């Protein structure tokens, strides 16, 4: 099957003498598994998923030291950027990075990623060939030239084809029965007040995992892709998700409508009706 690992890094400078805050979050199949935050009492990478407790202290030490280095690196790059963009000291700035790999169905490297954003906008990114860069503006063209001269791409390419892949395979092994779990949605329909003979029927899907899901209302079992109200999928805070879809219906005609719920944990799609 297809899998992925990613490290999301953020560095924010703040008004004053105080140094930037650096946060690094690791993910495997979009699930946070490690985290480092320079704001903590004793800054260190910490497991964020039970299965990471398997890693010994040499791992946490190595990773924490890598992060202490990143903190400085981001401090330097943030300063360089202020110069490229002609910005004064005393403002708030944000530098972000996303790095990692995607494995194909054959479990081989499908694509390597390494990009940066500044003030929330694309700054520079390594292309799929993992040899050349795409700069988003003039300032980033400065970085691009600098890195082509230094051969920065070769460093990331080795990481993306070596370490990223090796460790992603290891993590998938250690967290087998976890990343692959599913929680079927528990669904129900609510009924809400008729604006002049018209009632709103709302289909709720709750407690599901993962978050991918599709809710579809139908009339007499026939598709109803058009006048349907949806809500962005949301976290319940307990690890599961929620979502709902509603549709306006003529009071007295609600037994005709059915809501279909599709989700990987479901033995078959769910079919619901008001009451």
């Amino acid at each position: 099957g297809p899998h992925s690992m990613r490290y999301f890094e953020t560095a924010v400078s703040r008004p004053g003498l105080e140094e930037p805050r650096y946060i690094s979050v690791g993910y495997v199949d979009n699930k946070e598994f490690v985290r480092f935050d320079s704001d903590a009492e004793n800054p260190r990478y910490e497991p964020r998923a039970p299965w990471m407790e398997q890693e010994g202290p040499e791992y946490w030490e190595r990773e924490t030291q890598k992060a202490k280095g990143q903190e400085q690196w981001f401090r330097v790059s943030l300063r360089n950027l202020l110069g490229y963009y002609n910005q004064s000291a005393g403002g708030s700035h944000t530098l972000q990075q996303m790095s990692g790999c995607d494995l194909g169905s054959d479990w081989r490297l499908l694509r390597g990623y390494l990009q940066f954003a500044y003030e929330g906008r694309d700054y520079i990114a390594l292309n799929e060939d993992l040899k050349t860069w795409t700069a988003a503006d003039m300032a980033a063209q400065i970085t691009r030239r600098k890195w082509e001269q230094s051969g920065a791409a070769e460093h990331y390419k080795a990481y993306l084809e070596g370490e990223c892949v090796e460790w992603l395979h290891r993590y998938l092994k250690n967290g087998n029965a976890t990343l692959l779990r599913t929680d079927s949605p528990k669904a129900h329909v609510t009924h809400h007040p008729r604006s002049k003979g018209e009632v709103t029927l709302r289909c709720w899907a709750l407690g599901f995992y993962p978050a991918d899901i599709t809710l579809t209302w139908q009339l007499n079992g026939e598709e109803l892709t058009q006048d349907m109200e949806l809500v962005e999928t949301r976290p319940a805070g307990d690890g599961t998700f929620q979502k709902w879809a509603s549709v306006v219906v003529p009071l007295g005609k609600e037994q005709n409508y059915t809501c279909r719920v599709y989700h990987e944990g479901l033995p078959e799609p769910l079919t619901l009706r008001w009451e």
Binding site: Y7, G26, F74, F116, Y123, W147, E163, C164
Partner: peptide, 9 residues
């Protein structure tokens, strides 16, 4: 396992 930066932006 994360990557570290070498050359700066």
């Amino acid at each position: 396992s994360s990557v570290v930066g070498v050359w700066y932006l």
